[PDB]
Design a protein around this nucleic acid. Structure first.
Ligand SMILES: [Zn+2]
Lengths: 47, 232, 171, 183, 344, 140
RNA sequence: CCCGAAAACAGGCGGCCACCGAGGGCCCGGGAAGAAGACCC
RNA sequence: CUGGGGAUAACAGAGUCGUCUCGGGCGAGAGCCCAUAUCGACCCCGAGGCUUGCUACCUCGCUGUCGGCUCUUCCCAUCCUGGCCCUGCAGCAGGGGCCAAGGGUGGGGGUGUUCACCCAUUAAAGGGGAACGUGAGCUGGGCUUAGACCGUCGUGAGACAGGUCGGAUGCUAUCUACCGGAGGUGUUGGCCGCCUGAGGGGAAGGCUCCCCCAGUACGAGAGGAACAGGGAGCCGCGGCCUCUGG
RNA sequence: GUUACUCCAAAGGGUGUCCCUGGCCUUAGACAGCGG
């Protein structure tokens, strides 16, 4: 139950570490805040 | 922050001198610490009364106590006097300390009948029943040893280190090694030709279902285990 | 403690003389030179104040600790001669009012110390070689954050001439 | 400004007739005919002998962007009336197979996550959908309507209540106008 | 702070005496069947029946107690046709046509009737209106109707009203109206047993009442009851705004209001005072007569539940402008018992 | 259909009136230690400013035990009202009332803590709690 | 759903009278309406 | 007791914001590794005017009061209800954040209490403003006169931002405001009847539980959902007297 | 924004747009792409 076709459209996203808004894949800063720290949407669980 | 500073006094030689201290730093000051009595006190003097306003005579102090510095006589007031903690704080601190004791005992004490643990709830119940003299200015770690015997007969139990022998078909060993050694005291870590991890641990004996359930949750119930003698 | 906007400005007379001030406090800062002191580095990166300012010794010590830890983790004690140039000589006072007597006999008791700085004055300096200008700029930024007003950094060569634009272009 | 007289030019292909009626562009070809309104202050669209020319006589950045966008739109219209566009979708499920069927102007999806209720996607006019098992094709003559139909078929299957690392069932685009989607 | 909802509704304000005892209908339902969209009668009384439940929900299929109101409905008379056109903002009347032979009693409402107005003039006016409607200007056609209170010996001054027609073609509506004018119209030709209806009437009067009863205000503490303020409100408001707010409850007129009810079911339509249950013909009038209303003798509607108004008051009925989605069937239900014992 | 064989609840179409507010004393009809209880709550009820929660036949209440063997006294229990003095209507229109107010002690699920109910109980209660008429000898 | 021609573009329609008298009120017997007025038969 | 004082306190208001309530920047680190799921030192920058202080501009017979009951309204920095995003979100539940102020936010014990504490229910039982809303609306438990007792201080007369018992509550509405009810003028001659519907008001509805979907998806197990579809009830609103009670 | 003053919110950020300056690659450069 992996479905790379589903993953390529659920998980091709960036997240902002200040406000949390999602951003396109190649963004360099955020839309609402201008923060420069974007991390990719988590594709495996952490901790 | 004099708004809620509390009072401590020392009565001797026929006079009365109050202080205005922080209720939670006086706690440390008399518990035994490296003490910033400056931060403890609220106003830098000694006085007849906190609600009236009368700081006593310097040579009156010189006579009775023997000192000129006010911080030193306030230090000795905190030494040999009594702080006016509110009933709220007294109750709260008493309860917190005895909860600490109940945990400190349960986590490594069990009955020699079958090995079951004694829950903290009925530990507290046995305490309240027998009657325990919990000190609110003493150190818990150091006052437990008395509380041991004062409650042993009403509720018998011993310090019973359990020692266990565990098996794992290592496929998540790289997910359980650190998790299970967080506990500590892992002896003779051994292996097998099937990459399966077999060992013998010597943790405390009270906490067992924690270990069991965490292993089962981390291995999807793919773990074998056997309790060796409960070496006390 | 009390906010720094109370002590930021320099509109009061100087109050730096201890033979007359009763109960003045000692400094909480003792180290002003860190790193290597006899190593004749190339580039001098210096901070400069944008307007007149009054810096607390607390801020000074925080700047020191942070910048030095950074330079140690990244550059190495063998390099980075780090200096703070200004000493706290001003004495700050607070009115002992908050039973009370309010504004009766208001003349503050001493509480702390501060350094006075005028416009376009040097505050601190990092002496470093070319391969660590990145970290010297990082330290500039970190120190800039912990100041009551704004400041600008410049760079100097041996003979003390400005080469800031030429060095900034070519990285 | 940027330059003086920004000017973009498109060459008209085999049998494509391009006309302007004041702010509209008519594009006829072997298949179908398309219309589109494109206007911006100062931008002029006019036809030469065999060319489409887009002109502005003292432009800024935003005007340059507008011009290039209009050029791209006209090229898309030409390519559409010449060949067409084709999008591709892939169906996947873990449990509860779902059936997708075409009903007039709507695509209906049944047994999604086991729901007793069907999901519905609206097909726009001029688009045709074909379902052959786990693969779906949206063929059409205009890119915007085609992509919108595809997007509607996709958005008819979106979850918000459960973790998508585990609940992954649905329909997904795999090919846009002949351009695979890669991570 | 304690929260609670305010006392009374602001949706029925100002709470004043009704403009007329004859109630006005403001909105009409959208019906595809070309028919007159309502009727009018007089309230007679209440009784109860035992019927087998039809509507969706629990209790379906069981024998249940159901309260019932009776409304006497003698036939109406159609005396006119009106045409409406579209003006700048809304509808405006274009013209009217009347019948030539009207009862002598109609002059008690309309003091000024025409002098000669013969049948040929009436027909010429009909023709003019027909040609006017046959173009495309006209937007709506309505009937003009008057009650006949003299058949049932209640009074002699009729009530005069206007009623709309269903459908969406002015020409169909006009054909219907032209085949109706000048005649008597019965309730069985208009209503269908099992329908849901909205009833309209003016409520019973109660005069001036205080806020405890007019708004549901609380009675104060017994200390205030002995002080002289039990049935009063605390205060009229705060210091600022330095005026009394219109939302503060106060004493005034209670009752005699225009009110509309929703979704009352029509159970049965009777003729000449009788109802047919199982071949029998039984009388609805209880032994001794209805209290404050005598014997029913012409025709009557049986409506479920309660309706606004005193006994001899004029009631208006229309079909279900706002019905639910799970309507019960349009068919008379199975009735096992009708009470006609004494009611006083 | 999940769990209907082993069951504790059913449906009744009457909905009697609410006759007993908070503070009412109820005689116990079950063969449990309790004899008299007091109402301190009505399960499931939401009211308004200065309104007392009230209960009727078939409703579950929270109560305190005032009389009975020491094991039960001074405890908080649940119970169901099985007969009341205030008359209530049925579907045919005839009203029904009883001789006294009484209840039966149950578990939060609806399971009786007892094996015998003395006296007639109401069909409304028996319908809403299917595990009572079993242990009741008269149901009207 | 409730109020609503004093909506100052202070409205539309039909009918009656005027350019002695249409119509309205007091009065009389009474309520389904009501503090005086008003409303209804 | 007399004469005065807003040249001067208590008291609400104005000003200010040290303190208070609510936030932000940078990044030492904690989090098995991983600053930024969550937490976030030291140091710097702010908003509000709902806490307390500071000042003494206004009032010295304007009203000098706290709390409670009753009645109306507003703000959002959102406790529940509607819709979404990230997660160290398998499911059930939890953390954190975004849009939204339409509706809801209750009943009891001790205490004069506000607050705080506890009990059983509940979808949840949010917090503020309106002269610390509201005495020509009520109450009078506290507080702050004259009587009396205890403790302490004082030679004493006496006193105590110490404790305790007792201890007056006035109004015929002049103007405006609001709730309802009438009489006129105007609308370019008078009158009867039926309509239109510009404008204004509305919460006229809000919420919960049960059945089935289903012991299904998910999950090693333990446990454990959802879309649609069927029913019932609580709170609020508007009416009526056939039945039942007064 | 349409504020001389009496009587107007910041630290920190912004491939938002309009300008100035100083270096480095260029006729095969700086993306993507046929081809490791
Ligand atoms: Zn952001």
């Amino acid at each position: 139950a992996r479905f790379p076709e589903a993953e390529a459209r659920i998980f091709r996203k960036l997240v902002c570490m200040r406000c949390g808004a999602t951003n396109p894949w190649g963004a360099k800063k955020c839309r609402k805040c201008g923060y420069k720290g974007l991390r990719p949407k988590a594709r495996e669980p952490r901790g | 922050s004099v708004d809620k500073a509390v009072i401590a006094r020392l009565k001797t030689h026929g006079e009365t001198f109050e202080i205005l201290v922080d209720p939670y730093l006086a706690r440390d000051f008399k518990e035994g610490k490296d003490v910033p009595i400056e931060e403890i006190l609220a106003t830098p003097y000694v006085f007849k009364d906190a609600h009236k306003g009368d700081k006593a005579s310097e040579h009156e102090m010189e006579k009775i106590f023997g000192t000129s510095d006010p911080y030193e006589v306030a230090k000795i007031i905190l030494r040999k006097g009594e702080v006016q903690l509110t009933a709220e704080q007294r109750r709260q601190m008493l309860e917190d300390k005895k909860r600490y004791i109940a945990t400190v005992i349960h986590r490594h004490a069990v009955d020699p009948r079958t090995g079951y643990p004694h829950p903290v709830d009925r530990i507290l119940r046995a305490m309240e029943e027998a009657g325990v003299h919990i000190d609110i200015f003493k150190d818990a770690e150091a006052q437990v040893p008395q509380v041991i015997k004062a409650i042993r007969p009403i509720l018998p139990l011993k310090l019973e280190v359990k020692v266990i022998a565990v098996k794992i078909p290592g496929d998540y060993v790289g997910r359980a090694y650190g998790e299970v050694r967080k506990f500590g005291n892992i002896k003779r870590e051994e292996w097998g030709s099937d990459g399966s991890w077999m060992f013998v641990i010597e943790i405390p004996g009270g906490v067992e279902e924690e270990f069991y359930e965490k292993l089962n949750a981390l291995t999807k119930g793919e773990a074998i285990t056997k309790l060796l003698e409960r070496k006390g | 403690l009390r906010p720094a906007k109370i002590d930021r400005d320099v509109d009061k007379p100087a109050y730096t003389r201890r033979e007359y001030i009763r109960g003045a406090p000692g400094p909480k800062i003792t180290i002003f030179d860190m790193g290597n002191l006899s190593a004749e580095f190339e580039y001098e990166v210096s901070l400069h104040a944008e307007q007149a300012m009054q810096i607390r010794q607390n801020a000074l010590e925080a700047i020191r600790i942070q910048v030095n830890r950074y330079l140690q983790k990244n550059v190495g004690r063998s390099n980075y001669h780090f200096k703070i140039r200004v000493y706290p000589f001003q004495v700050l006072r607070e009115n002992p009012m908050a039973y009370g007597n309010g504004m009766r006999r208001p003349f503050g008791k001493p509480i702390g110390l501060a350094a006075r700085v005028r416009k376009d004055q040097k505050i601190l300096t990092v002496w470093v070689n070319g391969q660590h200008l990145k970290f010297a700029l990082g330290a500039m930024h970190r120190a800039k954050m912990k100041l009551p007003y704004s400041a600008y950094y410049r760079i100097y060569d041996k003979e003390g001439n400005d080469v800031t634009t030429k060095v900034l272009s070519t990285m | 400004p940027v330059d003086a007289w920004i000017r973009e030019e498109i060459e008209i292909p085999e049998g494509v007739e391009v006309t302007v009626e004041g702010n509209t562009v008519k594009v006829k070809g072997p298949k179908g005919e398309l219309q589109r309104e494109l206007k911006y202050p100062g931008v002029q669209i006019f036809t030469e002998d065999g060319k489409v020319v887009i002109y502005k006589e003292f432009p800024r950045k935003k005007d340059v962007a507008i011009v290039r966008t209009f050029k791209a739109h006209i090229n898309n219209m030409i390519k559409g009336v010449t060949e067409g566009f084709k999008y591709r979708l892939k169906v996947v499920y873990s449990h509860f197979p779902m059936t997708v069927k075409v009903q007039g102007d709507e695509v209906v999806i049944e047994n999604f996550l086991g729901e007793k209720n069907p999901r519905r996607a609206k097909i726009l006019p001029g688009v045709t959908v074909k379902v052959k098992g786990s693969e779906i094709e949206v063929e059409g003559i205009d890119k915007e309507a085609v992509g919108q139909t595809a997007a509607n078929i996709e958005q008819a299957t979106r979850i918000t209540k459960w973790d998508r690392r585990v609940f992954q069932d649905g329909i997904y685009i795999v090919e846009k106008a002949g351009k695979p989607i890669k991570f | 702070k304690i929260h609670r909802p305010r006392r009374g509704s602001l949706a029925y304000s100002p709470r004043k005496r009704a403009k007329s005892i004859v109630p006005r209908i403001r909105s009409w339902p959208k019906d595809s069947e070309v028919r007159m969209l309502g009727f009018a009668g007089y309230k007679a009384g209440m009784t109860h029946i035992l019927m087998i439940d039809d509507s969706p929900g629990l209790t379906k299929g069981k024998e249940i107690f159901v309260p019932v109101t009776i409304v006497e409905v003698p036939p109406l008379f159609v005396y006119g046709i009106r045409a409406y056109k579209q003006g700048y903002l809304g509808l405006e009347t274009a013209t009217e046509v009347w019948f030539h032979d009207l009862h002598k009693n109609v002059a008690r409402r309309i003091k000024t009737l025409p002098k000669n107005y013969n049948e040929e003039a009436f027909q010429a006016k009909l023709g003019q209106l027909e040609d006017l409607v046959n173009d495309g200007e006209i937007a709506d056609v309505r009937l003009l109707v008057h009650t006949q209170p003299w058949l049932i010996g209640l009074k002699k001054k009729p009530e005069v009203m206007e009623y709309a027609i269903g459908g969406d073609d002015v020409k169909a509506k006009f054909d219907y109206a032209k085949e109706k004018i000048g005649k008597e119209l019965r309730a069985g030709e208009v209503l269908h047993e099992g329908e849901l209806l909205d009833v309209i009437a003016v409520t019973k009067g109660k005069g001036t009442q205080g806020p405890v009863k007019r708004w549901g205000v609380k009675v104060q503490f017994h200390k205030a009851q002995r002080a002289g303020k039990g049935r009063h409100i605390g205060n009229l408001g705060p210091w600022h705004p330095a005026r009394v707010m219109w939302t503060v409850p106060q004493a005034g007129q209670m009752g005699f209001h225009h009110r509309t009810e929703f979704n009352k079911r029509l159970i049965a339509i009777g003729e000449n005072g009788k109802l047919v249950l199982d071949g029998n013909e039984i009388e609805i009038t209880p032994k001794g007569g209805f209290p404050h209303y005598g014997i029913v003798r012409s025709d009557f509607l049986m409506i479920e539940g309660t309706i606004p108004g005193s006994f001899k008051r004029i009631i208006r009925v229309r079909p279900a402008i706002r019905p639910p989605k799970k309507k019960p069937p349009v068919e008379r239900p199975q009735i096992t018992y009708v009470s006609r014992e004494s009611k006083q | 259909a999940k769990k209907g064989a082993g069951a504790t609840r059913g449906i009744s179409p009457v909905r009697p009136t609410r006759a007993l507010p908070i503070g009412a004393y109820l005689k116990v009809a079950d063969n449990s230690g309790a004899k008299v209880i007091q109402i301190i709550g009505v399960v499931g009820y939401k009211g308004t400013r200065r309104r007392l929660a009230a209960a009727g036949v078939g409703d579950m209440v929270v109560a305190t035990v005032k009389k009975g063997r020491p094991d039960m006294r001074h405890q908080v229990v649940r119970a169901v009202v099985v007969r009341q003095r205030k008359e209530y209507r049925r579907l045919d229109g005839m009203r029904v009332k009883f001789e006294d107010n009484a209840a039966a002690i149950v578990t939060p699920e609806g399971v009786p803590r007892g094996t015998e109910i003395r006296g007639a109980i109401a069909r409304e209660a028996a319908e809403r709690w299917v595990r009572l008429g079993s242990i009741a000898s008269i149901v009207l």
